[PDB]
């Protein structure tokens, strides 16, 4: 199914991406900054100072674990979905 | 980006699929049964009686709203991700 590739694509991208530095399956704030710059950047910019990341990162951490777990990581992935409104409703 | 198609593919599939019956952006238990049978079926089966759906549906509803909202819908989408363990770690 087309959704199977979408789901499978995310895991393959996450584990390969999460295995860049530090323990696998653990996104650090420094690692989070790299992911946003490389992955989410064409639709969102800003982030010019670490303090801007510290506020967003702490807010991102629902449990305040200081890092972004796989479970929350899916939330942020969804937030990018729930954040953007449907723009395909216009001709 | 390849993730942009994955995200966009989900919304296009959800709104077109959620617009099958009832108000748009509202998944009913009867609608939920159709989605699982058509979308999530090649990896999961069971579901032979409505009572099996009623237990799973009520459990699925984190807030017990009786229906599956777009936000929770993403959870169930993730649950299919967090439910299946990574099998790509084996040669
Ligand atoms: Ca990592
Ligand atoms: Ca966190
Ligand atoms: Ca519907
Ligand atoms: Ca619910």
UniProtKB/Swiss-Prot annotation, chains A, B:
Residues at which Ca(2+) 2 binds: 61, 63, 65, 67, 72
Gene3D superfamilies for the chain: EF-hand
Sequence positions that bind Zn(2+): 15, 25, 85, 90
Compartments it resides in: Cytoplasm; Nucleus; Secreted
Effect upon mutating residue 25 to A: Decreased zinc-binding
GO cellular component, one term: nucleus
InterPro entries with a match to the protein in the record: EF-hand-dom_pair, EF_Hand_1_Ca_BS, EF_hand_dom, S100-B, S100/CaBP7/8-like_CS, S100_Ca-bd_sub
GO molecular function: calcium ion binding; calcium-dependent protein binding; identical protein binding; protein homodimerization activity; RAGE receptor binding; S100 protein binding; signaling receptor binding; tau protein binding
Alphabetized SMART domains for the sequence: EFh, S_100
Function: Small zinc- and- and calcium-binding protein that is highly expressed in astrocytes and constitutes one of the most abundant soluble proteins in brain. Weakly binds calcium but binds zinc very tightly-distinct binding sites with different affinities exist for both ions on each monomer. Physiological concentrations of potassium ion antagonize the binding of both divalent cations, especially affecting high-affinity calcium-binding sites. Acts as a neurotrophic factor that promotes astrocytosis and axonal proliferation.
Assembly with partners or alone: Dimer of either two alpha chains, or two beta chains, or one alpha and one beta chain. The S100B dimer binds two molecules of STK38. Interacts with CACYBP in a calcium-dependent manner. Interacts with ATAD3A; this interaction probably occurs in the cytosol prior to ATAD3A mitochondrial targeting. Interacts with S100A6. The S100B dimer interacts with two molecules of CAPZA1. Interacts with AGER. Interacts with PPP5C (via TPR repeats); the interaction is calcium-dependent and modulates PPP5C activity. Interacts with TPPP; this interaction inhibits TPPP dimerization.
PANTHER family the UniProt entry points to: PROTEIN S100-A1-RELATED, S100 CALCIUM-BINDING PROTEIN
Full protein name: Protein S100-B
Organism: Rattus norvegicus
